[PDB]
């Protein structure tokens, strides 16, 4: 209990960030106090709250959190954080309405004593921020911002850094954002992760790693990127003898390492573990919940491949139901909640839980993965909520790096997923050893520029269904969406799309045609998917679209006039 205090409870000082703020901007309160508590991360020992009320009567109860300031530096090839000052408590708020707010601070410690601040007033003006990310009420396949604009996630997994820490995100994130990326995913476990909160203990959280996550979230705010926070990964509950990067023997949950659990099965029902896990959720909401740049809370990376001794489907389902209910109840901003599975079809018993707002797929497959993606997207429409292909690659073993230096695999997957009705792009692995060093960002730029001016929420897109290819001596296939006003096609050469040896394709002849069930007149735009630019525009009085010569794949945007 390194942060214990044994003094009578008293507020010693309050600092306020700024009294005039924009909608959805951060309003931060610093609270210096003394009190009686063994563990500042445990609300039964000390409970700090900010109570906010807008002009319209809406009330927000925001949990406070323990904080240490650091100053970062680079020591050759690793990040080093120097503590600045004593630790203290913070409250982080974000106003969803404009106008005036009144707020006060309340603190209670284990002695039962309670103290309060007096009431403060702040004023909120309109801003440019679109708000929090929600499921669209117009089309449950897609996400929106509070202001009604669509959110189409484009990006990749960027789940941890090297020893350089935040200095790696300083490089990766601006490159992503300038190439149309607006999304990434970070890991908050296991203990070795850059942002691991439970690093030494499941009862107290790592203030250095939490500060790094602050930094990366602040960078995402500056770049208009939105983050999925993955709280735990399967490795934590997998025994060494089971392989697949196991970590149970090293995890703080295990009694051997100071935790409450004798075996990983007990995670789901151990009373002490459940209490600590709720304290962790409270800490995460307190420290990061304000941010509109948190896209989603994700409980687990691939929970189905924890130890088979630990996976009891009924217990895992009840735990997800109960934690989703708890998290929603304490999160003033009601962020989206999800979880993930290694088994590509997922677990319907868990995916159908109402408290999980969208479903995910992870898939690593080397052969005919375009058809596999299309099949999984069609299948999971049964859940009537958005579907994110949250991990994709050729092989979990890392063959992609030497098989496909040009990123054709990534290219094929991001076009297939978007034009099959998934909520966003397939999210690649290998950010640090593949995407960045091979400079694969241009693939995303081309795709983002193709889709950005379409409002997916209102097109009533359906997968293309009544088509007729007329092509001779080539095998061309199509992935496509048909809506009220646009038809979007991705055509690929079945014999070239899965070969990765050739240079990036570097378009005047007629190849063939595709006939669609549409009413002319139409405008046809041919789009180079590697250079990310229009090749050709064509007005047509009949429903037969010519296919121009292409090497690997080609995109076509058809507007019904």
Residue with tokens 């088994």: 343
203 three-state secondary structure: coil
The string over 287-321, giving b where at least 16 C-beta atoms fall within 10 Å of a residue's C-beta and e elsewhere, is bbbbbbbbbbbbbbbbbbbbbeebbeeeebbebbe
Burial status of residue 560 (CB atoms within 10 A of its CB: 0-12, 13-18, 19 or more):
middle
CA separation, residue 381 to residues 62, 218, 385, 421 (Å)? 36, 34, 7, 9
All structural domains of the chain, each given as residue ranges with its CATH number in brackets, are 5-125 (2.60.40.10), 133-451 (3.20.20.80), 462-560 (2.60.40.1180)
Q: How far apart are CA 98 and CA 311, in angstroms?
A: 47
The experimental resolution of this structure, in angstroms, equals 1.6
Tokens of 180: 């149309």
> Considering Cα of 26, then 30, then 36, then 40, what sign does the dihedral take?
positive
CA separation, residue 51 to residues 19, 333, 531 (Å)? 16, 14, 52
The string over 10-24, giving b where at least 16 C-beta atoms fall within 10 Å of a residue's C-beta and e elsewhere, is ebeebeeeeeebbbb
Q: How far apart are CA 181 and CA 460, in angstroms?
A: 24
* Experimental approach taken: X-ray
Q: How far apart are CA 409 and CA 207, in angstroms?
A: 38
Q: How far apart are CA 213 and CA 187, in angstroms?
A: 10
DSSP type of residue 204:
S
Q: How far apart are CA 190 and CA 254, in angstroms?
A: 13
Q: Give the number of residues written for the chain.
A: 561
Count of CB atoms situated within 10 Å of the CB of 114 = 11
- The candidate with the shortest Cα–Cα distance to 526, out of 435, 514, 98, 518, is 514
Q: What are phi and psi of 39, to 5 degrees?
A: -150, 105
Residue with tokens 């000052």: 85
Which residues partner with 208 through β-bridges? none
Q: How far apart are CA 308 and CA 368, in angstroms?
A: 30
DSSP assignment of 271-302 equals HHHHHHHHHHHHHHHHHHTT-TTEEEEEEEES
Q: How far apart are CA 507 and CA 443, in angstroms?
A: 19
Count of CB atoms situated within 10 Å of the CB of 227 = 23
Residue with tokens 């919940």: 289
């Amino acid at each position: 209990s390194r942060y214990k205090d044994n003094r009578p409870l008293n507020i010693l000082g309050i600092d306020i960030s700024k009294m005039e703020l924009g909608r959805y901007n951060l309003f931060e309160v610093s609270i210096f106090l003394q009190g009686s508590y063994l563990n500042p991360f445990d609300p039964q020992e000390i409970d700090v709250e900010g109570i906010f009320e807008d002009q319209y009567g809406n009330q927000y109860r925001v949990p406070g959190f323990f904080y240490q300031e650091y100053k970062r530096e680079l020591k050759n090839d690793y990040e080093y954080l120097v503590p600045v000052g004593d630790p203290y408590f913070k409250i982080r708020f974000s106003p969803i309405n404009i106008g005036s707010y009144k707020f006060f601070i309340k603190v209670k410690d284990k002695t039962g004593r309670e103290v309060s601040s007096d009431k403060y007033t702040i004023y909120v003006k309109e801003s440019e921020k679109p708000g929090y990310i929600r499921v669209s009420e117009k089309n449950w396949r897609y996400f929106k911002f509070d202001n009604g604009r669509q959110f189409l996630p484009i990006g990749a997994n960027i789940c941890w850094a090297t020893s350089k820490g935040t200095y790696d995100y300083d490089v990766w994130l601006p490159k992503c954002a300038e190439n149309g990326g607006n999304y990434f995913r970070v890991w908050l476990g296991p203990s070795w992760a850059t942002f691991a909160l439970e690093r030494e203990s499941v009862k107290e959280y790592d203030l250095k790693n939490a500060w790094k996550l602050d930094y990366v979230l602040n960078l995402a705010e500056k770049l208009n990127m939105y983050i999925m926070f993955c709280f735990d990964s399967y490795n934590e509950l997998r025994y060494q003898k089971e392989g697949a990067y196991p970590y149970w023997e090293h995890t703080p949950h295990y009694e051997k390492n100071g935790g409450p659990l004798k075996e990983p099965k007990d995670f789901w029902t151990n009373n002490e573990m459940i209490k600590y896990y709720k304290n962790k959720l409270r800490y995460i909401v307190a420290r990061y919940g304000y941010s509109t740049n948190v896209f989603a809370w994700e409980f687990w990376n691939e929970v189905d491949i924890i130890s088979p001794t630990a996976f009891v489907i009924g217990e895992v389902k009840k735990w997800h139901e109960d934690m989703a209910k708890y998290l929603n109840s304490i999160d003033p901003w009601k962020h989206l909640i999800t979880t993930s599975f290694a088994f590509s079809p997922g677990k319907p018993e868990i995916d159908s839980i109402s408290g999980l707002n969208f479903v995910q797929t992870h898939i690593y497959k080397s052969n005919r993965y375009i058809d596999a993606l299309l099949s999984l997207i069609a299948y999971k429409e049964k859940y009537r909520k958005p579907h994110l292909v949250g991990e994709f690659g050729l092989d979990a073993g890392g063959n992609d790096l030497w098989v496909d230096p040009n990123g054709y695999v990534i290219h094929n997957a991001i076009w297939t997923t978007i034009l099959s009705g998934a909520s966003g792009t397939a999210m690649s692995w290998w950010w640090d050893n593949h995407i960045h060093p091979n400079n694969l960002y241009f693939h995303y730029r081309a795709l983002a520029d193709f889709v950005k001016d379409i409002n997916f929420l209102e097109e009533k897109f359906e997968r293309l269904t009544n088509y007729k290819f007329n092509v001779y001596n080539r095998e061309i296939k199509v992935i496509g969406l048909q809506g009220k006003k646009y038809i979007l096609l991705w055509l690929y050469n079945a014999k070239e799309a899965y070969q990765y040896k050739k240079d990036i394709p570097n378009s005047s002849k007629f190849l063939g045609s595709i006939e669609l069930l549409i009413k002319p007149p139409i405008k046809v735009i041919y789009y180079d998917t590697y250079r990310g630019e229009k090749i050709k525009e064509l007005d047509l009085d009949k429903n037969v679209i010519p296919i121009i010569e292409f090497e690997r794949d080609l995109a076509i945007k058809i507007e019904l006039l």
